[PDB]
Structure formats: C-alpha cells, structure tokens
Amino acid sequence: MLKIADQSVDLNLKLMKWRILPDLNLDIIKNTKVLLLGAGTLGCYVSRALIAWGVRKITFVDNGTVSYSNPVRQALYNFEDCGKPKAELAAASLKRIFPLMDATGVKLSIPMIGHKLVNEEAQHKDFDRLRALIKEHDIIFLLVDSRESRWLPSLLSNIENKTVINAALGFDSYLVMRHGNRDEQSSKQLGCYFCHDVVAPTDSLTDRTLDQMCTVTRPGVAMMASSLAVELMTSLLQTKYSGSETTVLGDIPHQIRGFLHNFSILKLETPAYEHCPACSPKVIEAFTDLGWEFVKKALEHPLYLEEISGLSVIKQEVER
Amino acid sequence: MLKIADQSVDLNLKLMKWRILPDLNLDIIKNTKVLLLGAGTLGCYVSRALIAWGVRKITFVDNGTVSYSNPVRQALYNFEDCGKPKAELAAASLKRIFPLMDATGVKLSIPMIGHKLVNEEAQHKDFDRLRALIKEHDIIFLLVDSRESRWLPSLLSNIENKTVINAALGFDSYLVMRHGNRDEQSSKQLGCYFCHDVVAPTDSLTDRTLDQMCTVTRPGVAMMASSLAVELMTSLLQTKYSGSETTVLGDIPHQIRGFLHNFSILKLETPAYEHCPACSPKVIEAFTDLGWEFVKKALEHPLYLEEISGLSVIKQEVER
Amino acid sequence: TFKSEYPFEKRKAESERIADRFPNRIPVICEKAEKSDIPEIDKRKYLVPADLTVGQFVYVIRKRIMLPPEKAIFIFVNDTLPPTAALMSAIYQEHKDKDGFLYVTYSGENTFG
Amino acid sequence: TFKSEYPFEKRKAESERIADRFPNRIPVICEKAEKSDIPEIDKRKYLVPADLTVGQFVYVIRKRIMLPPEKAIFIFVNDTLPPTAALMSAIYQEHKDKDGFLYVTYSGENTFG
Numbered sequence: 001m002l003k004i005a006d007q008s009v010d011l012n013l014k015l016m017k018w019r020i021l022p023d024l025n026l027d028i029i030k031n032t033k034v035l036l037l038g039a040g041t042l043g044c045y046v047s048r049a050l051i052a053w054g055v056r057k058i059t060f061v062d063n064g065t066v067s068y069s070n071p072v073r074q075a076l077y078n079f080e081d082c083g084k085p086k087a088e089l090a091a092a093s094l095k096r097i098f099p100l101m102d103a104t105g106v107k108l109s110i111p112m113i114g115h116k117l118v119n120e121e122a123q124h125k126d127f128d129r130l131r132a133l134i135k136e137h138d139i140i141f142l143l144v145d146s147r148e149s150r151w152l153p154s155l156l157s158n159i160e161n162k163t164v165i166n167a168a169l170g171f172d173s174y175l176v177m178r179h180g181n182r183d184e185q186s187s188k189q190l191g192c193y194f195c196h197d198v199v200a201p202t203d204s205l206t207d208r209t210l211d212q213m214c215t216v217t218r219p220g221v222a223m224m225a226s227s228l229a230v231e232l233m234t235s236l237l238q239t240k241y242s243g244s245e246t247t248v249l250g251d252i253p254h255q256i257r258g259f260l261h262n263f264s265i266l267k268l269e270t271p272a273y274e275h276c277p278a279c280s281p282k283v284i285e286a287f288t289d290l291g292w293e294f295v296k297k298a299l300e301h302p303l304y305l306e307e308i309s310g311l312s313v314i315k316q317e318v319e320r
Numbered sequence: 321m322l323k324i325a326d327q328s329v330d331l332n333l334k335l336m337k338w339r340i341l342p343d344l345n346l347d348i349i350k351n352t353k354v355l356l357l358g359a360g361t362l363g364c365y366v367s368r369a370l371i372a373w374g375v376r377k378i379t380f381v382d383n384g385t386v387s388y389s390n391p392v393r394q395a396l397y398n399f400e401d402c403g404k405p406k407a408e409l410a411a412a413s414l415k416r417i418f419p420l421m422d423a424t425g426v427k428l429s430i431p432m433i434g435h436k437l438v439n440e441e442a443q444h445k446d447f448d449r450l451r452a453l454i455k456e457h458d459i460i461f462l463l464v465d466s467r468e469s470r471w472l473p474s475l476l477s478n479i480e481n482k483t484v485i486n487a488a489l490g491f492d493s494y495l496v497m498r499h500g501n502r503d504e505q506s507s508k509q510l511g512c513y514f515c516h517d518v519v520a521p522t523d524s525l526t527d528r529t530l531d532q533m534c535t536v537t538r539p540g541v542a543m544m545a546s547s548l549a550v551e552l553m554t555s556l557l558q559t560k561y562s563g564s565e566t567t568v569l570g571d572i573p574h575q576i577r578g579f580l581h582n583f584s585i586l587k588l589e590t591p592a593y594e595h596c597p598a599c600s601p602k603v604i605e606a607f608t609d610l611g612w613e614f615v616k617k618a619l620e621h622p623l624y625l626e627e628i629s630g631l632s633v634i635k636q637e638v639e640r
Numbered sequence: 641t642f643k644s645e646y647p648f649e650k651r652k653a654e655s656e657r658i659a660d661r662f663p664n665r666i667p668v669i670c671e672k673a674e675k676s677d678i679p680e681i682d683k684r685k686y687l688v689p690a691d692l693t694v695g696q697f698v699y700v701i702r703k704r705i706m707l708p709p710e711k712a713i714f715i716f717v718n719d720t721l722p723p724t725a726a727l728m729s730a731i732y733q734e735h736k737d738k739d740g741f742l743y744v745t746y747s748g749e750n751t752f753g
Numbered sequence: 754t755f756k757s758e759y760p761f762e763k764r765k766a767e768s769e770r771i772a773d774r775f776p777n778r779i780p781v782i783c784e785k786a787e788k789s790d791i792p793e794i795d796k797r798k799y800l801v802p803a804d805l806t807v808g809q810f811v812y813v814i815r816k817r818i819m820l821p822p823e824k825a826i827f828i829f830v831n832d833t834l835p836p837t838a839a840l841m842s843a844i845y846q847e848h849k850d851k852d853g854f855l856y857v858t859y860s861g862e863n864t865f866g
C-alpha cells in the first residue's frame with residue numbers, strides 16, 4: 001500500500017505545479033537535505049510543514065527528552081512518549097506519518113557559548129559532530145530556545161556556506177529570518193540573528209529565574225513562525241526573477257517579524273554588521289585560522305568574542 | 321502519571337496569566353465547548369492549537385475517511401490510519417495527546433445546498449443532528465472544504481446564537497473570520513461568509529473537473545489560518561476594553577485575510593448585508609416560521625433562496 | 641496593468657473628460673488579483689452609474705467575465721472589502737485614486753479547508 | 754506615551770529649540786514596545802550626537818535602562834530595523850516625524866523555539 005500512498009502524496013504536489021504554477025520546481029524541494037536544530041514546538045511544526053511540501057530528508061538534532069507538558073504543544077509527541085529521547089522519537093514520528101521519509105534523530109548537545117566547558121574532549125566531539133551534520137545537509141533550521149544555542153550553529157553554518165533559516169518566539173510575537181551568506185562577487189551580505197544587538201551571546205539560563213522571564217508563549221506563535229519559515233525556504237529555493245527579489249512562489253524576505261495582539265506581520269532587512277559576534281569578518285578569520293582552539297575561548301569567554309569582533313572598540317569609543 | 325501530566329500542562333497555562341497577562345481569563349477558554357465542522361487539514365491544526373490553549377471539550381464533525389494523501393497534511397492522522405473514519409480517529413488522536421481531553425467524533429454528513437436530496441427522512445435526521453450539536457457547543461468552527469457546506473452551519477449557528485469562526489483556504493491565501501450575531505439592542509451586526517457576493521451557494525462539486533479547479537494549496541496556508549483562527553477565538557473570549565475594540569490579548573478583528581507570495585495579512589470588516597442568502601433577516605424569518613420545511617426548499621433550489629433574501633430583486637433591478 | 645500602461649497625465653485626463661461628459665457615471669478599472677485562480681477579460685474599463693450598489697457592480701463583473709454561479713469572489717478597494725450594500729458613488733468618494741479612477745480588484749473566494 | 758501627553762505644537766517646538774541650540778545632537782524619544790517583556794525607565798528623552806552609531810545608541814538604551822547582557826533587544830524606527838552600523842544622523846534624516854523628533858521603540862528579542 002506504500003506505493004499507492006507515495007503516488008497519492010506525490011500527485012498532490014505535482015498538481016500545484018502542473019495546474020497552478022508550472023514554473024514551480026518541486027524536485028529542488030524534494031531533494032533538499034534538512035537539518036533541524038531543535039525538536040520542540042518549532043521543530044515539530046516546521047517538520048510537519050516540510051513533509052507536506054515533499055521534503056524527504058530531515059534530520060532532528062536535540063538532546064532532551066519528552067516532558068509531561070510537551071505533547072499539547074509539540075505536535076510530534078504523545079502522552080505515552082513522555083520520558084523518551086526527543087530527536088529519535090521525532091524521526092520515528094515522521095515515519096509513522098510517511099513511512100518513506102528519511103527521518104533521523106541525532107541526540108547531540110549543542111555547546112552553548114557562555115557556559116563552562118564540563119568535558120573538553122566530550123564537547124570537542126560534540127563540536128565536530130555538529131559541523132559534520134551541518135556539512136551534509138542543505139538547509140539548516142535554527143529552532144533552539146536560547147540566544148546562546150544559536151551562536152555556534154550560526155557560525156559553523158556560515159563557514160560551511162549553508163543556508164540558514166532562524167526562527168525564534170516571544171510570548172506575543174515571532175521572528176523568522178534567513179542569515180546572509182558571504183559572497184566574494186557580491187559586496188552585499190544580509191545580516192544574521194546576531195547583527196541586531198551589541199552584546200556577545202552568553203549564559204542566560206543558569207542565572208535564570210521566574211523573575212527573569214517565563215518561557216510560555218501563545219500557542220499561535222509557534223504554528224505561524226513554522227509555516228512562514230518553511231514557505232520562506234520553498235520560495236528561496238526557486239530561481240528568482242531577473243529584475244526583482246521575487247520567484248514563482250513570490251517574495252523572499254530577509255527577515256519577518258509577526259505580532260498576535262494586532263494580527264500583523266512585517267517584512268524587514270538588515271545588512272551584515274561588521275562587529276557581529278557571529279558573522280563579522282574578524283570572527284570568520286579567527287575560525288578559519290584557529291578552529292576549535294578559538295571557539296573554545298569564545299565558548300567560555302563571551303567577552304573575548306567581543307574583543308575579537310570589535311564590539312569593544314565601539315563601546316570603548318562611546319565610553320570615552 | 322496522568323495527574324502530574326495534567327498539572328504540568330495546567331501550570332504552563334497559569335504562568336502566562338500569572339507572570340505576563342494577569343487580566344487573562346483562562347477558565348473561559350478551558351470550559352468552552354468547541355464544535356469542529358471538518359476534520360481535515362484545518363480541523364486538525366485548529367484542534368491542536370486549542371488543546372495547547374487549554375480547551376477541554378472538542379467535538380469533530382466529519383463524514384469522510386482517512387485518504388492516502390491525508391497524513392502528510394492532516395496532522396492528527398498517520399499512515400496506518402488510512403481507510404478509517406476521520407471524526408472518530410481524530411477524537412482518539414487528541415486523547416493520545418492529552419488523555420483527559422473530552423474529545424468526541426461524530427460521523428455526520430452536512431446536507432449541502434444545491435445537491436439533490438437523496439433520502440428525505442435520512443437527511444432530515446442529519447439536519448436535526450447538526451442543530452443539536454451546534455446547540456450544545458459554545459464556539460463552532462466552520463472548517464469544511466466547499467462553499468455549499470458552509471451555508472446550513474452558518475444559518476443554524478446564527479439561529480442558535482452561537483459564535484462562529486469561519487476559516488477557508490485558497491492556494492496562496494486564507495480567510496479567517498467570525499460571523500456576526502443578531503443583537504436586539506445593537507443595530508450593528510457584522511457580516512458573514514456569505515455577505516460578500518450576490519450568488520446563492522450551490523452545487524460546485526458534482527460538476528467539478530480539474531479544469532474547474534484543483535484543490536491543492538501551499539501547506540503554509542492551513543497552519544496559519546488555524547492558529548489565527550484560534551487566537552481570534554481566545555481574544556474574542558476576553559472582556560473587551562471600555563473604550564475600544566480590544567482585550568487583554570489584543571484586537572478582535574471581524575475578518576482576516578492573508579497571502580503567502582507577499583507574506584501579508586489584512587484585517588477587515590464588513591457589515592451584515594440585508595440580501596445575504598444566509599444572514600439576511602428575510603431568511604431568518606423564513607427559518608423561524610417554517611423550519612425544516614423551508615430549508616428543504618433552499619437545499620434543492622438555491623435560486624429559491626435568492627428569491628427569499630432579495631438577491632433577485634436587486635439583480636432584477638439592474639437587469640432592467 | 642492599466643497604470644503600468646499609462647502615465648498619471650493621460651490617466652488624470654480621461655478621468656476628468658469622463659466626469660465632465662457623464663457626471664452620472666463612475667470611472668472604474670476592474671481587474672483580477674495578481675495571484676488569483678479565476679477568469680478575466682480585456683475589458684478593464686467600466687463607467688458604472690453612481691446609484692448602482694457594490695453588489696450590483698459585482699454581478700456585472702462576474703457576468704461580463706463569464707464566471708459560473710457555483711464559484712464566488714470578493715473585491716478589494718485599497719485593500720478593503722466594501723460593503724456589498726453600498727453605493728458605487730459613496731465608494732468612489734472614499735477610495736478614488738488621485739488619477740480620477742476607482743481601482744477595483746476581484747479574486748476567487750477561498751473555500752478549501 | 755510622549756505624543757499622548759503633548760500636542761504637535763509643543764512637540765514641534767522643543768524640536769526646533771533643540772536644533773537651534775545643539776545642531777550636533779539629535780532629538781530622540783526612546784520607549785519600550787507596547788507588548789514587550791523588558792525593563793523601562795522614565796527617561797524617554799534623549800539628545801544623542803549625530804556621529805554616534807545605532808549600535809552605540811543601543812548600548813546607551815540597555816545601559817541607562819539597566820538591562821543585563823544575557824538578554825538582547827532590537828529597535829524599531831517606523832516599523833523598521835535600522836542597520837546597527839548606521840549613523841544616528843542618517844537615521845534621523847530618514848525617519849524623523851514631522852514633529853522634529855526621531856521615535857524609537859525597543860523590545861525584548863525573541864529566543865524561544
């Protein structure tokens with residue numbers, strides 16, 4: 001029955017090209033290898049939106065386990081799943097939906113800048129493991145839940161030259177954006193999640209208390225951010241039109257921010273900031289030059305990172 | 321383990337009130353009895369968004385079975401579920417997520433205006449069955465896939481005075497809106513799905529061919545329309561502010577339409593149109609006066625409906 | 641598009657020439673939404689009478705366009721859905737472009753779920 | 754709000770009185786986004802120097818506001834995210850309200866997933 005099922009889903013995709021958008025390229029989408037850093041609310045919704053699009057290769061990266069309150073908000077897990085490791089359950093879950101999916105679950109811990117290294121060798125392995133995964137996939141979705149967890153992936157992904165789609169939620173809002181990639185021929189590079197502030201991502205969980213901030217969000221933000229995130233990827237995957245920033249599936253914004261209280265959505269754009277503690281040229285040079293040696297330093301000394309990117313040369317300038 | 325689970329989900333909801341929106345009323349949402357007319361893509365997503373919000377009583381109304389291509393787009397069904405009846409599988413599915421859910425599945429066929437009555441008594445029973453269901457619930461979500469299937473539910477719901485949230489998808493867009501309710505004290509009533517055109521909903525499926533229209537949509541629309549639909553309901557459920565059309569959760573638009581090609585969203589509003597083949601006063605009078613006798617006529621003679629609401633007196637006027 | 645094939649001058653002109661000659665008609669340009677899946681005809685120019693309602697103007701559109709009654713449509717007027725029971729004049733008074741014409745878009749109504 | 758507590762006249766006035774007296778500073782009103790979950794202080798009025806970058810202006814905001822470095826923020830300027838490496842003057846040249854002041858909103862950056 002698998003054949004007839006495969007054919008059925010396939011025909012549905014073909015119909016949108018054949019009868020509506022003949023210029024649409026479904027193959028590019030189908031063959032795209034996707035790496036999902038995060039198997040929580042965003043990770044579950046984004047992954048559901050991707051099989052619907054025809055994507056066959058999806059890999060989940062998450063080191064946590066299914067919590068009691070996860071099911072109602074994380075659409076790939078059930079109540080019986082509680083206690084079990086997420087990444088794998090997640091891949092198993094996609095297969096229960098479409099058995100031909102090439103779903104995989106990697107229980108990997110993403111080293112977080114700002115936290116103390118607990119096991120050098122162990123966390124050096126984590127580091128290489130993550131880079132390999134980013135290396136083998138085509139689109140990396142940054143669906144983690146802390147500012148810190150986004151730093152390493154942003155960088156490795158910039159180094160491996162992969163496209164990155166970053167999604168993050170707030171209680172009432174959401175941000176979905178694609179990081180720029182450094183092109184030799186184009187003196188124009190779009191910003192990354194980190195080009196918007198002037199502080200180096202650091203430990204924000206260890207010191208966290210309810211006083212600091214509650215993590216609950218309005219259910220709606222997760223669903224929205226995910227769909228917009230996947231529709232961005234599918235459009236971005238289309239050849240753009242000669243004289244415009246558009247494709248067969250429409251625009252291809254750099255940054256999208258939404259708000260529920262006033263049911264709005266803004267498209268935006270921000271150029272790469274040279275003192276970014278993530279995409280700054282000085283930071284890329286340091287990585288290319290020293291690899292894991294430099295990262296280990298940034299990892300335990302966020303301020304160091306600032307010294308490297310120049311975020312200090314500018315605060316120091318204002319300081320005087 | 322059910323207790324500890326229940327407590328966990330409950331605490332997550334309480335935290336958004338306690339630490340973020342103390343004025344928020346979670347109880348009103350929790351106790352809301354929801355009727356979902358449609359257990360397909362919209363029905364599945366809307367239902368997932370509702371348990372996340374804390375809603376405990378959800379009833380699915382759908383007379384179809386799980387198709388081979390349904391799983392990848394309808395997030396409550398798996399591949400093994402193919403062939404089985406939707407409404408029930410759907411309710412079972414919610415329970416696998418949150419066992420304390422009061423999920424129910426009613427395999428009911430909604431009589432469609434424009435189609436020939438195949439079994440009077442049988443379809444008279446269908447009629448009463450639907451009204452009872454609309455009668456017992458508090459919010460009715462119209463998540464069906466044809467213009468015709470929306471007529472009867474719009475009317476019964478107007479008669480029983482229930483709030484209705486209507487969601488419909490297009491290939492690239494989506495519409496989410498709440499129908500107005502007739503208030504004796506307020507000479508202001510918002511429009512319904514049907515107040516926007518001047519044709520009486522009729523058979524559009526029997527004569528349908530690929531030439532007419534393909535039913536495929538971009539995966540994103542379903543997810544968006546659902547979340548916005550539920551966030552509308554949760555806001556609408558809050559006491560509005562004295563001097564404004566807003567609540568603790570923000571605005572409460574009448575109509576929301578979105579588009580993917582340009583990542584936009586519009587809020588809109590349309591007053592009740594007196595010649596609406598659904599909410600027009602003349603149509604309500606006819607129903608109050610003749611019940612099933614009148615409906616049977618509209619059901620098989622859409623043009624009749626027009627004669628009753630006045631859509632003929634206006635085309636006839638232009639005709640001269 | 642109409643504007644894409646004519647400058648403000650030539651457009652702000654035929655507008656006044658239409659107002660001066662038929663102070664009873666209304667200069668309306670009606671064309672299908674960019675990404676909508678429904679019929680369209682070369683007749684983008686319409687001079688409807690001011691007393692005619694939006695509903696009545698909508699009937700014309702679907703008639704002239706040869707649209708079946710099984711499929712519905714909605715119309716935009718500066719990203720707004722005009723009351724179906726409003727006078728095409730009152731609409732023109734509120735949404736007319738500085739070029740003298742009232743721009744109207746129509747698109748297939750959403751019905752999937 | 755600032756505008757909600759002062760009319761166009763009194764606001765279009767202190768703007769020119771500030772331009773005439775300090776042609777090197779920039780009249781900026783900085784306040785937290787309506788629905789954002791972060792710190793705020795009564796000092797909504799700022800007169801920063803034109804050569805100072807947005808980044809530098811952002812440092813001030815989080816400093817003066819007493820915001821920790823673990824939490825980030827972004828700023829709106831007419832529903833736009835100004836390049837972090839832009840001169841507060843060039844920004845004022847493009848987003849100043851007719852009342853002479855540059856309105857800026859800041860909000861907690863989104864980090865959940």
Ligand SMILES: Nc1ncnc2c1ncn2[C@@H]1O[C@H](COP(=O)(O)OP(=O)(O)OP(=O)(O)O)[C@@H](O)[C@H]1O
Pocket residue numbers: 037038039040041042061062063064065067069070073086108109110111112143144145149215865866
């Ligand atoms: N450093 C990391 N390495 C691997 N996975 C991570 C890392 N940090 C976060 N994650 C994963 O990111 C996902 C975020 O999902 P999400 O925040 O929505 O739910 P949660 O973190 O499990 O708990 P909650 O529902 O309260 O937020 C989680 O599944 C979490 O395990």
Ligand SMILES: Nc1ncnc2c1ncn2[C@@H]1O[C@H](COP(=O)(O)OP(=O)(O)OP(=O)(O)O)[C@@H](O)[C@H]1O
Pocket residue numbers: 357358359360361362381382383384385387389390393406428429430431432463464465469535752753
């Ligand atoms: N008259 C009706 N009575 C009861 N249920 C209905 C009626 N009409 C439609 N439905 C249900 O509405 C749902 C619409 O879901 P949806 O259109 O997204 O998927 P589908 O109709 O099953 O097939 P497809 O994925 O191709 O659209 C279906 O589950 C269908 O069975």
Ligand SMILES: [Mg+2]
Pocket residue numbers: 040145215866
């Ligand atoms: Mg979390």
Ligand SMILES: [Mg+2]
Pocket residue numbers: 360465535753
């Ligand atoms: Mg269908």
Ligand SMILES: [Zn+2]
Pocket residue numbers: 191192193194195272273276277278279280
């Ligand atoms: Zn950057």
Ligand SMILES: [Zn+2]
Pocket residue numbers: 511512513514515592593596597598599600
């Ligand atoms: Zn109506």
